[PDB]
Amino acid sequence: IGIRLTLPPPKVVDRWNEKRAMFGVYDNIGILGNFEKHPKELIRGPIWLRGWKGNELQRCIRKRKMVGSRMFADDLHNLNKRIRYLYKHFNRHGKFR
Amino acid sequence: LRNRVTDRYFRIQEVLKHARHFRGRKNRCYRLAVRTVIRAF
C-alpha cells in the first residue's frame, strides 16, 4: 500500500531547447556594456520583488506599501493579519534575545 | 516544492524482516514489532 505498482512514464528533458541554451545570456550586461543597465533589471516577476531580498515580514511590508491600494479586500485583510502575527512572532517570541 | 516519503515500504520492511518468527501482532504491525526487534538485538 502507498507505493505505485507500475513504473511512471519515462521523463525526457530537452537539455538543448532555446531556454536552456540561452540561459544566463546577458548576465554581465553592466560589465560588458559600459554599465548602461544593471543585471537586476533583467529580473521579471512581482513589482515589489525585483532586485530585493528579505524575510517574510519584510516581504509582506513591502507588498503592502507598494501594491496595497490595488489588492483585493480579503487579500489585504489577510496581509494585515499576517503582518501582525509576524511582528508578534519576531519581536516577542523566540529562543535568542 | 512539496516533498513526500516514497520508500516507507522498504523502511518498514527493514525492521519487519527481523520480526517474522515472533508470536502475535508483533511480527506484522510495525509499532509493535519495532520495540521487540530492539529488545531482541
Binding site: 507505493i3 505505485r4 505498482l5 507500475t6 513504473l7 511512471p8 521523463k11 | 513526500r4 516514497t6 520508500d7 515500504y9 522498504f10
Partner: peptide
C-alpha cells in the same frame, strides 16, 4: 500519486523477485 522514480523501480525489482519465487524457472 507521489513524485519519484527510484522507489517505483526498487519496488518493481522486489515484485520481480517475488514473481520469480512464486514461479521458479526451470
Amino acid at each position: 500519486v507521489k513524485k519519484g522514480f527510484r522507489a517505483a523501480f526498487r519496488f518493481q525489482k522486489e515484485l520481480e523477485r517475488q514473481r520469480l519465487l512464486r514461479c521458479p524457472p526451470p
